[PDB]
Design a protein around this ligand. Structure first.
Ligand SMILES: CCCCCCCCCCCCCCCCCC(=O)OC[C@H](COP(=O)([O-])OCC[N+](C)(C)C)OC(=O)CCCCCCCCCCCCCCCCC
Ligand SMILES: CCCCCCCCCCCCCCCCCC(=O)OC[C@H](COP(=O)([O-])OCC[N+](C)(C)C)OC(=O)CCCCCCCCCCCCCCCCC
Ligand SMILES: Nc1ncnc2c1ncn2[C@@H]1O[C@H](COP(=O)(O)OP(=O)(O)O)[C@@H](O)[C@H]1O
Ligand code: ALF
Ligand SMILES: [Ca+2]
Ligand SMILES: [Ca+2]
Ligand SMILES: [Mg+2]
Ligand SMILES: [Mg+2]
Length: 994
């Protein structure tokens, strides 16, 4: 239906041929699904992986090498005849390291996308509908919604299709349609038609748009359009503009990437400038301009060598890996910074009901007044069996199954429960189990009244679907519901205004049925009901009422309590103004106390363990709830937030007690207290805000719309998969599992991703610095060139490639979740760690020149033996005073340069073995802890052996094969780097701080 906003409610119903309270017939649905198709959009896929591949070449550090390959290709036309084959291999050595890392990056990205799509599609989205099929509202898959059926929506829900609003059940209906219209604040909805058929979505104040959220209230509507015809569907098939952005740590590493790029660039020109006296040498033979091309070529090669190619890829890989690992644990990562931020988390704030607890509610205890005699007050307590939402159970009084209709107080208690209710119960035929519709608290009431057969309705001859709401429907026929004062968290109650059916109870008049937090409700009671009689509320009566609440609340069942009351003489219907909900409390005053229900809601089994694990990692857990302080404290003990016997006067507050504190004291109570109770949505974010003012990284966890503001304020917000769409929207991560443990797992992965980056930087800095100090040491000592441009590129390809990237697959350290969280103030590279880099770098540079010097000097079987004449090698042409009588060209020998290249490769493969952990010993964290690294090392080590022995290769790379005694020298000089960092790890672990 186009322009349904322009048509009236009557016109839309007649348009599809639907009774408002009935909905579509099964035949009407069959035809509509055939006519309109399913309520869904064309699925997203991942065929060609180019947008992926192209992104793989977008960073600065990668495009620097991309430029270097072009210069090497343009300079190939400048090469003449002789050594042409050597010049054309150069760009393929630069380009091969870039492709190898791109393959890993793209591969890891696809796996992450698939794991995400496997988790997002897993649980089908549901909708509430009225269909001729059933008397009560029924749950169906959102895709099975057709234009025509009557759909029901309420606070927290996601609007499933484009709806023409027919009836607003609350005093107001507010909607979060920022995803569409752009407007931040919730917008008020009405039922009046908007004449303009060309009016923009903002003006369609009587429509609900698919994929938006009910911020407030409850509504009945008729479906205008579904599928691709939806207002949000038109901009999904075309306007697929991404919300992509790089994380804080990504930007921190990219900032660090440019920092190195400049430093390398400076010590790169510092090679071309310290070798100006070689532009005219017998080695090249060329002119002053020709020799400058060669040392420019050394520079560009040293740049490529020093520049971390893998850095941009490895972080993106580690992030994609993190998203995949979370998807395996059933956690939807909505924002990329999620995992890395949870690594920093020092305080996890958490709502109780439905988050720390299962939200599987059932009334197991209730009471009404029995007898009031002056100073004496006694209660009629009762017990109820069944823990699920099944209308299967018994009402027990002194262990005996009783007829609820017997007690007049229970008749009224059931009446309130049934009438003052925005929820129902629906039987899932497929699963074979009764499922809640709306709020858990309220549905526990629904199933309570079905168990209480107050008017002795015949139920045993009804189908499972009919049995779900039978006795509730009976009560609904007794009183007409005029309107409801919705549940508000300032009041912590809800009210229903009812007139009689005009049959039996007709003689009396109007009533208001009230349900809420016992504290507030009982205070607004001036009377208590005894059977059908009424007596004044007194001190002794109130004290008795409250004492049993406290009993059930702080007991071992830690019951969630709710008081029930009626306004025997409500205000005139025309003397109540419904525009402002701040007036609702006064309409719910002069009440008569009827009774109290206590409902069990068991804590999630994984919660106690997770909190202890959080404690080990130095993370605090804070319960923030609107429920009673007593029960809240009792539950905190059950989940380990407080000890069983710990004193909590300093550490537990109500919202009122909190507000009574000066602002400075409130702030302080946040770093002290672990339980906040009878709180508000404003309080939850305020607590998070106070936590953040001590520069703590804070998480919020919740299910309810009351949690959305705090979830938005926290560094990372975690929603329950079984919670509201509103809370999911406010969040960076959804636990579709509802597994609280996944939060702790996400904390471990966030620390792992950071530590893997640290060891990646450890390896690339300490290694590449050594390659630089190798070239500078030869110039500083006056020794012949240790490497050529092509040889530098090979060192790069074989050391900076997969061996570096495989570090991103390191396992977590053995004490990763036993150390307090990392400070935000903490810099990327520690002062001690920057010395660590220079100590390893200095050694690998001195070892490379030392091995080349060894060949010229001590190497007996290796040709050319000299003493202290390497320093002055540019002399034998003009002046040979102490020269033995050997060749005056043995300084151009490939053998010492092959030793240098060989050591530089081998020592860095050894240096990679150090980068499994920061401070932990190599014996304690063995090399076989990362098999991916060992596979990469052996691939580099094998590839290096190919370049030496396969006939055309040593000629192209200007090398000569080593002796089995010369390889032992490489091993004798490289292996000690394991021991060197081992001493440095011993100092950092034992002497400094572990
Ligand atoms: C003119 C042409 C010149 C020819 C010269 C070409 C020589 C280059 C040789 C090989 C290129 C290397 C590409 C390897 C990319 C691997 C991508 C990948 O699977 O990543 C996920 C893999 C698998 O990780 P995962 O995360 O999916 O595994 C899950 C398990 N946990 C959770 C425990 C991690 O991760 C790797 O990136 C880790 C790094 C190790 C590298 C693996 C290589 C194995 C070693 C040798 C085999 C290479 C032969 C194959 C040749 C292919 C040629 C195209
Ligand atoms: C061009 C040739 C360069 C020659 C320069 C001569 C430098 C001297 C060389 C060796 C002597 C070593 C002794 C110095 C160590 C004392 C410094 C110190 O206090 O360190 C600990 C401090 C302590 O750091 P912290 O405050 O984080 O403390 C951590 C300590 N724990 C872990 C115990 C808590 O580390 C500093 O942060 C290091 C200074 C950062 C400098 C930035 C590095 C830039 C790198 C290269 C730039 C190139 C420079 C070119 C110079 C051009 C000049 C115009
Ligand atoms: N639908 C409802 N009608 C009346 N009272 C309610 C309803 N839902 C909850 N309450 C009461 O209001 C209190 C505050 O609710 P809320 O702020 O959501 O905290 P929580 O549900 O976590 O206790 C609850 O503890 C409960 O006693
Ligand atoms: F479920 Al709560 F405060 F504990 F919203
Ligand atoms: Ca490099
Ligand atoms: Ca290197
Ligand atoms: Mg909750
Ligand atoms: Mg709640």
């Amino acid at each position: 239906m186009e322009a349904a906003h322009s048509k009236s409610t009557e016109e839309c119903l007649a348009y599809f041929g639907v009774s408002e309270t009935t909905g579509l017939t099964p035949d009407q649905v069959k035809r509509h699904l055939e006519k309109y198709g399913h309520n869904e959009l064309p699925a997203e896929e991942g065929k060609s992986l180019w947008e992926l591949v192209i992104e793989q070449f977008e960073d600065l550090l990668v495009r620097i090498l991309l430029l270097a390959a072009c210069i090497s290709f343009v300079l190939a036309w400048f090469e003449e005849g002789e050594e042409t084959i050597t010049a054309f291999v150069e760009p393929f050595v630069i380009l091969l390291i870039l492709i190898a890392n791109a393959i890993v990056g793209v591969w890891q990205e696809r796996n992450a996308e698939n794991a995400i799509e496997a988790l997002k599609e897993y649980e089908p989205e549901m909708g509430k509908v009225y269909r001729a099929d059933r008397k009560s509202v029924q749950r169906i898959k959102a895709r099975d919604i057709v234009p025509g059926d009557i759909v029901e929506v309420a606070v927290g829900d996601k609007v499933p299709a484009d709806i023409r609003i027919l009836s607003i059940k609350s005093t107001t209906l507010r909607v979060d349609q920022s995803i569409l219209t752009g407007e931040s604040v919730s917008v008020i909805k009405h039922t009046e038609p908007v004449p303009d058929p060309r009016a923009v979505n903002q003006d369609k104040k009587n429509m609900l748009f698919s994929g938006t959220n009910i911020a407030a209230g409850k509504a009945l509507g008729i479906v205008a359009t579904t599928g691709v015809s939806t207002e949000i569907g038109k901009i999904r098939d075309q306007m697929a503009a991404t919300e992509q952005d790089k994380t804080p740590l990504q930007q921190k590493l990219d900032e660090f990437g440019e920092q190195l790029s400049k430093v390398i660039s400076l010590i790169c020109v510092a090679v071309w400038l310290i070798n100006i006296g070689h532009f005219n040498d017998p080695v090249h033979g060329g002119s002053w301009i020709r020799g400058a091309i060669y040392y420019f070529k050394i520079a560009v090669a040293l740049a490529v060598a020093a520049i971390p190619e893998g850095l941009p890829a490895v972080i993106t890989t580690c992030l994609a890996l993190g998203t995949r690992r979370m998807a395996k644990k059933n956690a939807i990562v909505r924002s990329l910074p999620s995992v890395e931020t949870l690594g920093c988390t020092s305080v996890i704030c958490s709502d109780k009901t439905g988050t720390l607890t299962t939200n599987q509610m059932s009334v197991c205890k209730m009471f009404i007044i029995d007898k009031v005699d002056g100073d004496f007050c006694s209660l009629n307590e009762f017990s109820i069996t069944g823990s699920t939402y099944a209308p299967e159970g018994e009402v027990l009084k002194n262990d005996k199954p009783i007829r609820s209709g017997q007690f007049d107080g229970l008749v009224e208690l059931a009446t309130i429960c049934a009438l003052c209710n925005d929820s129902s119960l629906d039987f899932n035929e497929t699963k074979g189990v009764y499922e809640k519709v709306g709020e858990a608290t309220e549905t526990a009431l629904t199933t309570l009244v079905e168990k209480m057969n107050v008017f002795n309705t015949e139920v045993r001859n009804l189908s499972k679907v009919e049995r779900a709401n039978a006795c509730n429907s009976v009560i609904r026929q007794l009183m007409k519901k005029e309107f409801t004062l919705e549940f508000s968290r300032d009041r912590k109650s809800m009210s229903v205004y009812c007139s009689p059916a005009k049959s039996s109870r007709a003689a009396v008049g109007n009533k208001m049925f009230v349900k809420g937090a016992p504290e507030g409700v009982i205070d607004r009671c001036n009377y208590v009901r005894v059977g059908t009689t009424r007596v004044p509320m007194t001190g002794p009566v109130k004290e008795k009422i409250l004492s049993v609440i406290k009993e059930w609340g702080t007991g071992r069942d830690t019951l969630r309590c709710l008081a029930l009351a009626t306004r025997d003489t409500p205000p005139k219907r025309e003397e109540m103004v419904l525009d402002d909900s701040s007036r609702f409390m006064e309409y719910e005053t002069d009440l008569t106390f009827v009774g109290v229900v206590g409902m069990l809601d068991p804590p999630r089994k994984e919660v106690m363990g997770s909190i202890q694990l959080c404690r080990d990692a130095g993370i605090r857990v804070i319960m923030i709830t609107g429920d009673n302080k007593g029960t809240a404290i009792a539950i905190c003990r059950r989940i380990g937030i407080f000890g069983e016997n710990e004193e909590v006067a300093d550490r537990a507050y109500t919202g009122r007690e909190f507000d009574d504190l000066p602002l400075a004291e409130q702030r302080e109570a946040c770093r002290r207290a672990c339980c906040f109770a009878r709180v508000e949505p404003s309080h939850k974010s305020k607590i998070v805000e106070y936590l953040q003012s001590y520069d703590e990284i804070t998480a919020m966890t919740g299910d309810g719309v009351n949690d959305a503001p705090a979830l938005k304020k926290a560094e990372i917000g975690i929603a329950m998969g079984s919670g509201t769409a509103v809370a999911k929207t406010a969040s960076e991560m959804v636990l579709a599992d509802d597994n609280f443990s996944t939060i702790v797992a996400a904390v471990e992965e966030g620390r792992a991703i950071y530590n893997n980056m640290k060891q990646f930087i450890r390896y690339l800095i300490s290694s590449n610095v050594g390659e630089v100090v190798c070239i500078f040491l030869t110039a500083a000592l006056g020794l012949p060139e240790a490497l050529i441009p092509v040889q530098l590129l090979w060192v790069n390809l074989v050391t900076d490639g997969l061996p570096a990237t495989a570090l991103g697959f390191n396992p977590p350290d053995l004490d990763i979740m036993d150390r307090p969280p990392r400070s935000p103030k903490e810099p990327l590279i520690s002062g001690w760690l920057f010395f660590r880099y220079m100590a390893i770098g200095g050694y690998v540079g001195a070892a490379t020149v030392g091995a080349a010097a060894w060949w010229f000097m001590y190497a007996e079987d290796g040709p050319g033996v000299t003493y202290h004449q390497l320093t002055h090698f540019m002399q034998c042409t003009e002046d040979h005073p102490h020269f033995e009588g050997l060749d005056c060209e043995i300084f151009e020998a490939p053998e010492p340069m092959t030793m240098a290249l060989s050591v530089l490769v081998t020592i860095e493969m050894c240096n990679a073995l150090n980068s499994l952990s920061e401070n932990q010993s190599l014996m304690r964290m063995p090399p076989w802890v990362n098999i991916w690294l060992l596979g990469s090392i052996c691939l580099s080590m094998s590839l290096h052996f190919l370049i030496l022995y396969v006939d055309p290769l040593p000629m192209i790379f200007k090398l000569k094969a080593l002796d089995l005694t010369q390889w032992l020298m490489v091993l004798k000089i490289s292996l000690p780097v394991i021991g060197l960092d081992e001493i440095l790890k011993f100092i950092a672990r034992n002497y400094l701080e572990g």
